[PDB]
Amino acid sequence: NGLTVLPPLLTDEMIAQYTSALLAGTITSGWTFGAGPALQIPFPMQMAYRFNGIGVTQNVLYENQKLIANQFNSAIGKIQDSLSSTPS
C-alpha cells in the first residue's frame, strides 16, 4: 500500500452551493451582479437586453415571449435526455 487520497477542500455540497448561488444571481439580476452589487430585474427585460446584445431589438422578444419561453423550456428538457441517453 503506502498510498493516500486526500479529500477535496470544498465538498460536492459546497460546490453545488456555489453553482446555486451563480444561477440565482444570473436569473434574478443578469450580469449586474458580477460588476458589483446585484440589481434585480424581471427576466423578460434581462432577455431583451441579451437580445440587444446580439443586434435584435427588444420588440422581437416581447412579441414572441411565449414562443421563446416554450423553446427554452423544451431545450432545457431535451438536454437532460440528450445527457442520460448518450453514454459517452
Partner: peptide, 19 residues
C-alpha cells in the same frame, strides 16, 4: 462559511438602478 447570505428582491416589474 462560503459567503454572506443574500436574497434578491425579484418581482415581475421591479428593477434596481444605480445613482
Amino acid at each position: 462559511s462560503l459567503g454572506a447570505e443574500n436574497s434578491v428582491a425579484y418581482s415581475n416589474n421591479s428593477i434596481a438602478i444605480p445613482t
